[PDB]
Design an enzyme around this catalytic site. Sequence first.
Site, PDB file in Angstrom:
ATOM      1  N   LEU C   9     144.765 -41.829 -45.291  1.00 13.34           N
ATOM      2  CA  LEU C   9     144.445 -43.174 -44.832  1.00 13.34           C
ATOM      3  C   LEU C   9     145.538 -44.192 -45.115  1.00 13.34           C
ATOM      4  O   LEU C   9     145.721 -45.120 -44.319  1.00 13.34           O
ATOM      5  CB  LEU C   9     143.134 -43.646 -45.459  1.00 13.34           C
ATOM      6  CG  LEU C   9     141.880 -42.946 -44.937  1.00 13.34           C
ATOM      7  CD1 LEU C   9     140.653 -43.794 -45.196  1.00 13.34           C
ATOM      8  CD2 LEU C   9     142.010 -42.654 -43.454  1.00 13.34           C
ATOM      9  N   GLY C  12     148.721 -47.434 -50.918  1.00  8.28           N
ATOM     10  CA  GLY C  12     148.884 -48.650 -51.683  1.00  8.28           C
ATOM     11  C   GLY C  12     149.972 -48.480 -52.725  1.00  8.28           C
ATOM     12  O   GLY C  12     150.235 -47.382 -53.210  1.00  8.28           O
ATOM     13  N   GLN C  13     150.593 -49.596 -53.101  1.00  3.55           N
ATOM     14  CA  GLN C  13     151.856 -49.521 -53.824  1.00  3.55           C
ATOM     15  C   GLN C  13     151.741 -48.755 -55.136  1.00  3.55           C
ATOM     16  O   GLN C  13     152.761 -48.299 -55.662  1.00  3.55           O
ATOM     17  CB  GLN C  13     152.393 -50.931 -54.067  1.00  3.55           C
ATOM     18  CG  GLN C  13     152.848 -51.631 -52.793  1.00  3.55           C
ATOM     19  CD  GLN C  13     153.518 -52.965 -53.059  1.00  3.55           C
ATOM     20  OE1 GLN C  13     153.552 -53.441 -54.193  1.00  3.55           O
ATOM     21  NE2 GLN C  13     154.055 -53.578 -52.010  1.00  3.55           N
ATOM     22  N   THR C  16     147.623 -43.535 -53.684  1.00  6.62           N
ATOM     23  CA  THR C  16     147.584 -42.996 -52.334  1.00  6.62           C
ATOM     24  C   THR C  16     146.136 -42.786 -51.923  1.00  6.62           C
ATOM     25  O   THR C  16     145.378 -42.115 -52.630  1.00  6.62           O
ATOM     26  CB  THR C  16     148.360 -41.684 -52.249  1.00  6.62           C
ATOM     27  OG1 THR C  16     149.631 -41.847 -52.888  1.00  6.62           O
ATOM     28  CG2 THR C  16     148.595 -41.327 -50.809  1.00  6.62           C
ATOM     29  N   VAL C  17     145.752 -43.367 -50.794  1.00  3.33           N
ATOM     30  CA  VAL C  17     144.360 -43.429 -50.377  1.00  3.33           C
ATOM     31  C   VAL C  17     144.158 -42.415 -49.263  1.00  3.33           C
ATOM     32  O   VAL C  17     144.751 -42.531 -48.186  1.00  3.33           O
ATOM     33  CB  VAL C  17     143.975 -44.839 -49.919  1.00  3.33           C
ATOM     34  CG1 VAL C  17     142.520 -44.880 -49.502  1.00  3.33           C
ATOM     35  CG2 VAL C  17     144.249 -45.837 -51.026  1.00  3.33           C
ATOM     36  N   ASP C 123     144.289 -60.787 -56.603  1.00  2.00           N
ATOM     37  CA  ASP C 123     145.138 -60.342 -55.495  1.00  2.00           C
ATOM     38  C   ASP C 123     144.255 -60.223 -54.258  1.00  2.00           C
ATOM     39  O   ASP C 123     143.655 -59.176 -54.013  1.00  2.00           O
ATOM     40  CB  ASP C 123     145.821 -59.027 -55.821  1.00  2.00           C
ATOM     41  CG  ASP C 123     146.717 -58.543 -54.707  1.00  2.00           C
ATOM     42  OD1 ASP C 123     146.979 -59.319 -53.768  1.00  2.00           O
ATOM     43  OD2 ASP C 123     147.153 -57.377 -54.765  1.00  2.00           O
TER      44      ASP C 123
HETATM   45  C1  V0G Z   1     141.559 -44.765 -31.517  1.00  2.00           C
HETATM   46  C2  V0G Z   1     140.243 -45.012 -32.265  1.00  2.00           C
HETATM   47  C3  V0G Z   1     140.411 -45.578 -33.686  1.00  2.00           C
HETATM   48  O1  V0G Z   1     140.253 -46.733 -33.877  1.00  2.00           O
HETATM   49  N1  V0G Z   1     140.743 -44.699 -34.804  1.00  2.00           N
HETATM   50  C4  V0G Z   1     140.879 -45.289 -36.137  1.00  2.00           C
HETATM   51  C5  V0G Z   1     141.891 -46.202 -36.390  1.00  2.00           C
HETATM   52  C6  V0G Z   1     142.016 -46.769 -37.654  1.00  2.00           C
HETATM   53  C7  V0G Z   1     141.132 -46.415 -38.665  1.00  2.00           C
HETATM   54  C8  V0G Z   1     141.281 -47.066 -40.054  1.00  2.00           C
HETATM   55  O2  V0G Z   1     141.467 -48.234 -40.108  1.00  2.00           O
HETATM   56  N2  V0G Z   1     141.184 -46.285 -41.288  1.00  2.00           N
HETATM   57  C9  V0G Z   1     141.323 -46.979 -42.573  1.00  2.00           C
HETATM   58  C10 V0G Z   1     142.448 -47.740 -42.845  1.00  2.00           C
HETATM   59  C11 V0G Z   1     142.560 -48.398 -44.063  1.00  2.00           C
HETATM   60  C12 V0G Z   1     141.546 -48.294 -45.005  1.00  2.00           C
HETATM   61  C13 V0G Z   1     140.420 -47.531 -44.745  1.00  2.00           C
HETATM   62  N3  V0G Z   1     139.321 -47.390 -45.706  1.00  2.00           N
HETATM   63  C14 V0G Z   1     139.399 -47.636 -47.147  1.00  2.00           C
HETATM   64  N4  V0G Z   1     138.341 -47.365 -47.876  1.00  2.00           N
HETATM   65  C15 V0G Z   1     138.336 -47.560 -49.181  1.00  2.00           C
HETATM   66  C16 V0G Z   1     139.474 -48.064 -49.790  1.00  2.00           C
HETATM   67 CL1  V0G Z   1     139.471 -48.336 -51.553  1.00  2.00          CL
HETATM   68  C17 V0G Z   1     140.577 -48.355 -49.005  1.00  2.00           C
HETATM   69  C18 V0G Z   1     141.888 -48.913 -49.570  1.00  2.00           C
HETATM   70  C19 V0G Z   1     142.063 -49.678 -50.713  1.00  2.00           C
HETATM   71  N5  V0G Z   1     143.358 -49.958 -50.833  1.00  2.00           N
HETATM   72  C20 V0G Z   1     144.038 -49.400 -49.789  1.00  2.00           C
HETATM   73  C21 V0G Z   1     145.419 -49.416 -49.469  1.00  2.00           C
HETATM   74  C22 V0G Z   1     145.872 -48.763 -48.331  1.00  2.00           C
HETATM   75  C23 V0G Z   1     144.974 -48.092 -47.501  1.00  2.00           C
HETATM   76  C24 V0G Z   1     143.620 -48.079 -47.818  1.00  2.00           C
HETATM   77  C25 V0G Z   1     143.157 -48.745 -48.978  1.00  2.00           C
HETATM   78  N6  V0G Z   1     140.486 -48.121 -47.710  1.00  2.00           N
HETATM   79  C26 V0G Z   1     140.313 -46.880 -43.519  1.00  2.00           C
HETATM   80  C27 V0G Z   1     140.112 -45.511 -38.414  1.00  2.00           C
HETATM   81  C28 V0G Z   1     139.987 -44.944 -37.147  1.00  2.00           C
HETATM   82  C29 V0G Z   1     142.438 -43.648 -32.091  1.00  2.00           C
HETATM   83  N7  V0G Z   1     142.674 -42.566 -31.142  1.00  2.00           N
HETATM   84  C30 V0G Z   1     143.839 -42.850 -30.327  1.00  2.00           C
HETATM   85  C31 V0G Z   1     141.517 -42.321 -30.297  1.00  2.00           C
END
Ligand code: V0G
Lengths: 281, 65, 298
Positions: C9, C12-13, C16-17, C123
Amino acid sequence: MYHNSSQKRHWTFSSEEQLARLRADANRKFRCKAVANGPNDPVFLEPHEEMTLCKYYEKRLLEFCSVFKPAMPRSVVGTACMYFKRFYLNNSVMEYHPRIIMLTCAFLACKVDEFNVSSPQFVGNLRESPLGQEKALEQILEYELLLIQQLNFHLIVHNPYRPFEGFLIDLKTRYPILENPEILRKTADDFLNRIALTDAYLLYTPSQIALTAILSSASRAGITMESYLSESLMLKENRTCLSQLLDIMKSMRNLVKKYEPPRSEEVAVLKQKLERCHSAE
Amino acid sequence: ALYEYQPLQIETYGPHVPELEMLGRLGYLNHVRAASPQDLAGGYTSSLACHRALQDAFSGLFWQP
Amino acid sequence: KRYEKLDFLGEGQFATVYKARDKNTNQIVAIKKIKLAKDGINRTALREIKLLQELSHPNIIGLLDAFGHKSNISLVFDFMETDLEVIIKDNSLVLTPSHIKAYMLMTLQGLEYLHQHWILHRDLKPNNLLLDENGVLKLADFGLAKSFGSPNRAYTHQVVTRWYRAPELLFGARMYGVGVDMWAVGCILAELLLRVPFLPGDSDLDQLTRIFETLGTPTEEQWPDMCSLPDYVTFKSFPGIPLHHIFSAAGDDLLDLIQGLFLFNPCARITATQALKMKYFSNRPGPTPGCQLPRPNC
Ligand SMILES: *[C@H](CC(=O)Nc1ccc(C(=O)Nc2cccc(Nc3ncc(Cl)c(-c4c[nH]c5ccccc45)n3)c2)cc1)CN(C)C
């Protein structure tokens, strides 16, 4: 805030009997596991022996915290002692040695609280050779995850010291008939340590402990401050709650009363027995 | 689908803690150290300290499991 | 161990999520594994653990589980669809005033919950306000958040991303209250309104210059006692552009709320409780239900 804290929900029990039940269950399950992996062996330890050993090692933890080279804030000391009590409430002194868990609790209280100590400094605060310091440090890091898991990931611990300060502020402002509560502060610090030594932290809210400390200082000071709870706490119109607060105060002062320090010969024999248990695993 | 403000009203077993603003001229601040100009330049006010002290002094009193 | 990994997914700095699933219940969670010695479990992971365990709000993710090994751990939150950074940076999703009202309302509800429990989410930014399929925001990253009651502590002065830093943080304030998250929320609001990061900076110097060139250098009476801060460096009297010219597509109530969020005085800055009592949230355009928020597809 305590009132919805994890400590209140999970790590606060009904009566001392539940503490005894949990400790005896942990010890008996460890004895069963040791026997089944390999029942009355003269090396096994009875729950009261475990209690005395844990008392002695909690005194050791208090000494080590108080003679920490950088000033250890009382929040970290209380957090470490509570971690020790919580860990050994559900685990045995035989499976995990209380010196290592003592140091691990101090380390995790330094780290969970926002005290900033570098791990080399932390171990250099021990009384060993540098290779011994490194062995102790690696043991601490090995046991830190175990400590956190056995605390069920409830790392926040509400000490009675902040409620103690809040109650003194209230006494200063809303209670005029009492004057100069600083003498109460000294005697309540004394009582609050003496109640940290016993198992009151797992049975009473920190606010009850702080109120009991300040009112016990009042009682031992020849100062009757029963009017504080009656009026200026709105309890004069709530009789059941006032009765329950006085009951809790009496019960926990008596809980302080029925606590005796671990002996000298008894702790010595339990220590050598514990070493024999750690050698012949 | 209009929104109407609801006080959160989380339960606190214990005496009603005096409100943060209705706390400076009840005399409480006379017994907590003053907010130094560096402290007061930021959001700190030396009344957060007194309010948290009072709030954790009454966190759980009328509670027993 | 029990969680089978589905997808990567993000990063984060400090951790890794990944995305994963559990066996006891058919649902989707997000794991967050700390990166990798000699100093035990990473302190950020312990802020997450110790500080998300005691909070139970609809608008704050509670870590479902946590596991690990000798010196590394990994937290388990419920998998949470997207975040406001994706929605803002998306161009196909038009944000009607109802949508922004819903987002800001949910943020402010979560923040009043957090501030009542004397926890300061130091933050806060649109990359941390997550929102799921049901369309409910949750303040995700608690990696660097503390408790703002004690006078005995001493905060380090740089704990927030620069664009969303309150000016009192930028002058290096050892002690600060809820004004931090409130200015962060104001910056999030401005970004949502403009779909562009409000006040994009390069350093503390640049962030101060842009803040004051957009809102007006304080007057020692709008923010009294600013001279007392450590990093107080004087800038000339920037007139500051008026707010109604920037957020032109915003009603009078919204401008009043934005003014409230952006007072340079931290103590006179509005708090989350009294920000939710303003007319903006109770005016005729009602915030959209979570069943009708825009879905940032792909
Ligand atoms: C099209 C269809 C489609 O939309 N597919 C799709 C796109 C994008 C996502 C998505 O956003 N996933 C996602 C991104 C970031 C974060 C999360 N969930 C999450 N849950 C808990 C936590 Cl603690 C965190 C988190 C905390 N700190 C973080 C840093 C960095 C990243 C995450 C993070 N995040 C979900 C899903 C589906 C696509 N095709 C073309 C059809």
